[PDB]
């Protein structure tokens, strides 16, 4: 009850690109709607993550961070359930007015990056992935990378982050052992693609200048001044099982 | 500190 019951209330709506598909689809098009996209969907899991039980029990300065660290992953592990549940899998549903079809992922030159996310999705399905595991997973993966030098106050984070690993248990109660293994696997699968994507949109953003790609605020912000944290290896997700 | 600002706003 309680925990699920807070999770399915705090779980945000539709969130709309605002692309126009009435233009033939472009690389420099598709990939600025994307960037939108991720903007608007930044200050849904702003207003999320702030209102997940426990949150506050971070320093200030740690919930701003993981926040940050965490925003790809949770865009990735979110659209891939939506894509799921959607179009089962078929194509990969950014957002009602921005589908890709394999033209598009074609189009974006981001391919490779799609094939993995697409991959992800159709695990939600082969998995039999619920609603409710979904939500526990995606809570989980908030607090899934940290810098290697620890954060603000670290005991406070390890203490939630255990109390997450803790109700993902609950809900899946030798098949408890089996399950949480693949859910475990699942959430480890996330971060080598959210690595992808970072090395991908840190390299548009550096070029985006010459290829016509719009950055939003808030993103240029964060892939400019903490994602090369993660790529230079300053901060590093934290994964269940050894890669 | 357009995060930041963010962050604060809601
Ligand atoms: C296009 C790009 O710059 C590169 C990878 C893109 C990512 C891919 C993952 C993603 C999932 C969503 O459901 C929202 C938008 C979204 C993105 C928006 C902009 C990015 C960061």
Same mark, same amino acid.
């Given at each position: ?28 098009? *598709?990939?600025?709607? *994307?960037?939108? /996209?991720? @903007? ?10 702030? #209102? ?6 971070? $320093?200030?300065?740690?919930?701003? #961070?993981?926040? +940050? ?15 799921? &549940? ?19 992922? $074609? ?5 490779? +990056? ?8 159709? @695990?939600?399905?082969? *998995?039999?992935? &619920? ?10 993966? *908030? ?29 899946? #109660? ?7 293994? +693949? ?7 996330? +971060? ?8 991908? &949109? ?6 985006? $200048? ?20 993660? /790529? ?9 099982? &050894?890669? | ?10």
């Amino acid at each position: 009850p309680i925990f699920l019951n807070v999770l399915e209330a705090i779980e945000p709506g539709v969130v709309c690109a605002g692309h126009d598909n009435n233009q033939p689809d472009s690389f420099a098009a *598709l990939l600025s709607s *994307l960037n939108e /996209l991720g @903007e608007r969907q930044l200050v849904h899991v702003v207003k999320w993550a702030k #209102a997940l039980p426990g949150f506050r029990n971070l $320093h200030v300065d740690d919930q701003m #961070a993981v926040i +940050q660290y965490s925003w790809m992953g949770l865009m990735v592990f979110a659209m891939g359930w939506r894509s799921f &549940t959607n179009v089962n899998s078929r194509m990969l549903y950014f957002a009602p007015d921005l589908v890709f079809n394999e033209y598009r992922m $074609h189009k974006s030159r981001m391919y490779s +990056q799609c094939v993995r996310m697409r991959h992800l999705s159709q @695990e939600f399905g082969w *998995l039999q992935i &619920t609603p409710q595991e979904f939500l526990c997973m995606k809570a989980l993966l *908030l607090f899934s990378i940290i810098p290697v030098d620890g954060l603000k106050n670290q005991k406070f984070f390890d203490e939630l982050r255990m109390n997450y690993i803790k109700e993902l248990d609950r809900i899946i #109660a030798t098949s408890c052992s089996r399950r949480f293994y +693949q859910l475990t696997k699942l959430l480890d699968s996330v +971060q080598p693609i959210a690595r992808e994507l970072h090395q991908f &949109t840190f390299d548009l953003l550096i070029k985006s $200048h010459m290829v016509s790609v719009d950055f939003p605020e808030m993103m240029a912000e964060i892939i400019s001044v903490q994602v090369p944290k993660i /790529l230079s290896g300053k901060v590093k997700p934290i994964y269940f099982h &050894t890669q | 500190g357009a995060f930041q600002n963010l962050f604060q706003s809601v």
